[model samples]
Target chain A: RMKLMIVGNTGSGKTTLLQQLMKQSATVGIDVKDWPIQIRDKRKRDLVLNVWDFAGHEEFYSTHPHFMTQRALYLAVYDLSKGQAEVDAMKPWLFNIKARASSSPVILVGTHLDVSDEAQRAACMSKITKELLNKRGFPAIRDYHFVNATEESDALAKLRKTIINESLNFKIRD
Target chain B: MKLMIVGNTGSGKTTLLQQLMKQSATVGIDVKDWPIQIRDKRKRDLVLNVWDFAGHEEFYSTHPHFMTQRALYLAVYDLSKGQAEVDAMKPWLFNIKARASSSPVILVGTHLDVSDEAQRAACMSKITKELLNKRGFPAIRDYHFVNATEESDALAKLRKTIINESLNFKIR
Candidate 1:
């Protein structure tokens, strides 16, 4: 099983992502490992994902660095409707994971794409590029994906693929 | 336990419910219900019926009938938006007091993570004190705060309040 940690701001759609992951699963089982949700690998490679979701409130930010352990993938999320200018708002979280895990891969997940209009979508993309891409002092990412938690099966597929692909080289807990 | 969670858009009502319901979840102009199990004062299991009303303005007209005395109201407002949003909740509070005069109301501040702590402390205290003194309406039962992402002491208190208040509501 892979331990995947999700962190974001309030209304950033982290829980929705969890729900989507559960729905896309070929087989979802009760959490035997004591995580919130467990997704059984349908492709059959002895894969399971133990999902851990952190609350996005400022009050909970202090609890973040404590769980920023190695051998896990951190999904740093931000809301698209808030605009890409707010990308910088998620910097603290990315930095925390990188500082603690160092080797752990952090992926940027932009949420609420389905709700944003064309201008908003374009602005978020531009902001992601200008603020994050080729930037110094930013934690390097495994990849980036924009998701709409309500109806984006493709986004979930891409996320699952990325996770499965990364596990090929990385470690997985029993 | 019959409870209603009402607030403005982006006030973190749905998010808070997700935390409460252990689903870690939205409300449009519609309504949704979930069945929850809780312990009463007698330590017996009770089926708690939770009603989540959309925060849209159009949904306000449908609230009074549901505000029965046997229910509890969670009046949530976004703290990051500052006091204006808090001010807007007064009318809702007033209406709840008018309809469910004997029902308990808990004033909740959502989005506490993005808001300024000191400012929220000062604002909430002022608002709570004013409302208690009949700020042109009846006083609510208590005040609380939450950041939907963090299951901190505040959440524990809210959970406790839900059960305790529900039991008391039943006793009446």
Candidate 2:
């Protein structure tokens, strides 16, 4: 089973992103779901992707590291609707991911694209790409995507495909 | 027996109260409906009335009206936030003292699972030196550090302390 961990601060659209991916709704604490993804590896094979949606509030930070493992893939989600400070807040989550699962691949996800303007998106994108992406001691972010999780978009489809393609690279055990 | 829990939002007051009573976490309850009933495990026959205060600044003005000398105070602060959070404990303590002058307060530093041990020790020392025995304030009896989300021995010690303090208050 492969694991996909969604992490960000409160109101960062983590649950909304999970809902977009799994096509469902969400909770206060940790929500674990086993999502079946169909991958064509020879024939049609079903892959059980363990989705761990963590509560992003400050109180839950202590226990988050314990659950994070190198065997998982990460989506470091940030709200595009907020300002540059929200992008800066991603540092703690990124640092935590690096500390616990240094080898795991992380995807930088900017959510709520519908509510944000071009200026806000560009500003956040610049900060994330220049300051956060591939930074020292931070997990090497595999890619970045901007999406409106509430509705279907090309970005969401691309993100979904990216996750599937990334999962294919992981060595399956159990 | 009366127990009053006070802290900033997200400092783990409600969770601590739930843990102390061995109750499952549910939806947030209105502060008016508090002073919830819990039995003293030591006594078995005695019942405790627990108060959960809303930690928001908007509710602070109304907090003093409910404060009485009969209650035991748990002044909680987030340990992970460090000295700034530790320093933030003063206003809550000041409010408690102004309304309930004789009540015994137990300073609770929560998020122990995330905080640095050295910082925790330093914060405790600072609290003991500065926060305790101040003029015109109620004396804080002891400090307990805990992670309310998990079941730990520290929670047991805190429960014991609350029971012992409540008993002592009754005797007084």
Candidate 3:
């Protein structure tokens, strides 16, 4: 049983990735009518995945509290190809996750490398991902794969590894 | 119960507010029929409100444009960049406490240490936010720190608190 959490900026294709997962498994997508949490996974495989697909716009930001819980996973997804890709964008989500999740394992993820279209940016992200292994006190780490959920082979492998690695490590989330 | 959303530049304040009003419990309305528009063809939003103050310094001046008396004030801060959260809060705190004190305030401490870098740096930690809570320039404000997007009742708890305070503040 592995608890996998995915967090990313809007348009980073989080839902697409989740769709990919559902394709890989029989995931029942449930819509919550509650305040705050728009998406929740009652059980995905051996784990309960409470994936939050927040409204990307600025107005719906306050409902962050409704979904935060103790047994949670914190992830921040970013788009590298978009000039808007920033460590700063995750700030709001980070605070909410920290205040709410309190010591969950957080995996900082940089998404959308597939947009590089076989260029240096994709190679660069891969290189950076490898380089982190040598860096100590690395506060952040870039995940592997140029994910085009439409092209799921590589992404599926990478996601499986990530789910396994983080669950085993259980990094201090908050 | 009128609830207003507030936050710094690109802190997702407007989006959060729209989602709040869409809830059946809040406005007792079904937004299923709202006109649909799309960006790259995503579904259009169902509900909206004019109660958000963007963190640009200009919006900070004309508070009346978006707020009414007894409005629940959601003061949002991004915790990942603790400096941004702290900097954003200074003026917001001053404005709400001094000018909109009649309004009930909820300090939505956002961007919990979502990154390992931030976890190591207490710059965004609870202690920092709590310290800001004591500062007088913000007029000794009372607030709540939360990752507004998490589903573990963090958002629900904050919303409930804000509503309760709004009710009590109105009574006072």
Candidate 4:
């Protein structure tokens, strides 16, 4: 069993990513459930993913830390279509994760790549790596990827693979 | 000028208000913190008092007390959610009309970047028809579609509309 935590600001497409990921397993005779997703790793090992899709409003911030667990893998999602100011808003979420789940691995996922250009994506990626990742007391951000959750893409596929591999790695470490 | 921003939770009301606040000039006032000072094109200085109502059902009861007359109302909804979301604006309209009947409401549809234009057009048309056909609703000054975070042009247009509409309240 793995806990997958998705966090982002309001309208950052966290819920959409969860919906897309859930839809991927529907054709494989899977139940296509909302939460507690079931998928098999490359070794034919069945993994039950308990997703914690946190609400992004500031009013809920006080109660969010209660649900943050060290065993969960965090997906710190943001909107790529927005400017640097919106990207910077992810700092609070990262800091919270660092404080609450110190050892948990965080993967920075940027959504709305389809609407954004290559230059914008590159700029955002550079900013995230240089500014956010280098910050002290920040959570362990393992990797970053850009994906358009409304449609299927190679980026989404790679994200899924990365999550499964990371979950396995997390289990071994534990 | 008082503008009451009302919408569902996560429907982009806070972001819309933020953008509106950013457009206006800040002035030193010892009275209250939420009121913004804006200068119109005609060199008129107006203090914009914005009431951002909490969208959660638990806080709905407290909203009516602040629904004062002579204020502009912005009814925001997520266009990406389509027709059902547009239809959900009825109760908000009813409440606004019931309390501040003279206040002009502007239907603001957010998330234009990700939503389908055709679907948005259809939803707007349907809502417009419903409002026109049904009596005793708040007067709708205009309809605006915007991406609160991304589109500066759309936000500017919205701000212009708001300032122009607020001018009407000043005339009265």
Candidate 5:
């Protein structure tokens, strides 16, 4: 009895994560304009993940977040390698969501961890993860995880567990 | 004088250079296709040390080298990646003031190939460029929206505008 909504800027691995979720859960991903809304579970409870992969364009600023309903679990993901990419990704959306996103649970995550070595990965994850945890007090975080979306299996697993546990609490949808 | 062409991947800096050279090279001779082509309507003896930089995010580490010359700067970005365009254009602009401490250059936009009829008409049109010029960028510091596919035209216009700002009467 859960629905997940994945939100991140373009080239931020949102689409790949959706596809991987389909494969992992033995579900069919139907492309509604190349982005399918996934529905699974025999409760016929009709769980759907309205995932949106928005291009980082001024034009998309308004319509991109329309799919993000109340109680939606948000993943604020960014590129680790590009200079200032993380800043660019998080700042605007954080402002947008915080102001009008209906008090949703946002799990700020970073992708492209493979670009760095183990030591670097450990350091970045530790620092960023700690900051996210302390940002607004919450319970054990199933929503946060390091990922390289190019690999299918790992990407889906990370978010799958998050939605399964959290989506039950807030049943916000269209 | 030198010219720099910068922007996202496939923004057409290369083709523009060729067009500029083609027009200037044929100054004496009455070329058969001069008026027939939009790229052939330029008049000038152009010698340009032009550099078209890579636009990939991965390549920004090596960007400082091209920014050093005090000649002229072309802070290019893509119309599609609005965020990337802002992010990419800012550093190049700031560096011209901070890092290069260079001559005034244009804030040009390349890649007229992919933009829509409206977007291209609005930003890449002649009227819009003139508007940019009036905004304290009448110097070599200006903006252009040219079709890279029409290589000759882009290069010619780039050289023509930049040379207008150089201290030397004719480009060496």
Candidate 6:
């Protein structure tokens, strides 16, 4: 079972985007859901998606080190509605994940693309890449994706397929 | 029944309200109250007044006055976040219990679709145990999960709770 953790600030739409991937509806009366989804790989092995959606509250941001596993995939999510500042703020999550799970590769995710124009989303992504990607002292940022978090976004399918492919490959390797 | 929906910023307070109200709202401080009319088990027309609070900490001060007596409080949180959210819910439930004076509070978990089954279950069990046995918040009447993006089954359960269990609700 590979863990795919989704981290973001408050209102970053992490869970909404998660629903788009699971093709399922959403929750919290402490409701947690996961699937042994079959990957799109040759063997089509069932990848246990131990998806973790951390608390967005800063007060609860204390690093629960056990939750961060070294071999897991991480998604650093940010909301486009907040514009640039939100992207910059995601650095803390990177730091937490990197410090805890140093080997884990994180994908920079931007949500609510439907709320922003091309320029805004691109500018935000650019700023995020500059701050997090290929920089000295930063962990691995595997990739980035912009999600609509609604039915309108075709990006969900792409990201899901990518994750399935990646997870299967992850399961197969060192 | 006036239900005050309150939670932390980005905890899906507005989204749940949007799902319940059948409306669309942008992110930020949403202070609008949604009036939902439904029939009770007895087929009586009942009006449910839902007060939506922004997840931002700034708006929490307004809750003291808005925490009306006998009004059900839906303390929403992100299910994917689970226990941390449940733990974070304490302060909120404290506020509601203190000001609302033991008003019935429902712990509504939003974003249930994206979390690990074990993690989610652990979080819920912890919170429920704390509320019922540990006497943590003391005012939580019940808890349920919801998907804020679509018409989730959790929402249906909540709708039923509002219609059936909320005996304090007044007929409009």
Model 6 per-residue lDDT tens digits across residues A1-174: 245655666567765665565551133321111213332345434323211122233211211123225445666778887788888887776776666545666677788887887878878978976687866556677678888877645677677656655544554422
| Candidate 5 CAPRI grade | incorrect
The fraction of reference A/B contacts recovered in model 2 reads: 0.00
Q: Tell me model 1's lDDT, rounded to 2 decimals.
A: 0.57
> In model 2, how large is the Cα lDDT of residue B26?
20
Ten-residue segment with the worst summed lDDT in candidate 4 chain A?
A26-35
Error of 1 at B136 (Å): 63
> Candidate 5's chain A scores what TM-score?
0.55
Docking class of 2: incorrect
lDDT values of the candidates? 0.57, 0.64, 0.44, 0.62, 0.42, 0.57
Q: Which ten residues in a row have the lowest lDDT in candidate 3 chain A?
A: A24-33
What is candidate 2's local distance difference test score? 0.64
User: What are the per-residue Cα lDDT tens digits for candidate 4 across A1-174?
Assistant: 244666666567776776675551111110111112222225333322111111122222211223325456777788899856656877877776666566868888899999987887888977887888756688777888899989888889788767655655675432
Docking class of 3: incorrect
Count of clashes in candidate 4: 0
- Write the residue-wise lDDT of candidate 1 on A36-119 in tens digits: 322233442321111112122221122222332444555677787778665777777666655655566666788888777788
TM-score of each: 0.38, 0.40, 0.34, 0.38, 0.33, 0.39
Off by over 4 Å in 2: A24-68, A172-174, B1-172
Give the total clashing residue pairs for model 2.
0
Q: Residue B15 of model 3: what lDDT?
A: 39
In model 6, the Cα lDDT at residue A15 comes to 54
Strongest candidate by DockQ: 6
lDDT digits (tens) for residues B1-172 of candidate 5: 2344443334334344344434111111110100111122254321111111111221121123432443454555555433345445544444444534535656656565666666555554433434334333323445666664455566566655655544332233
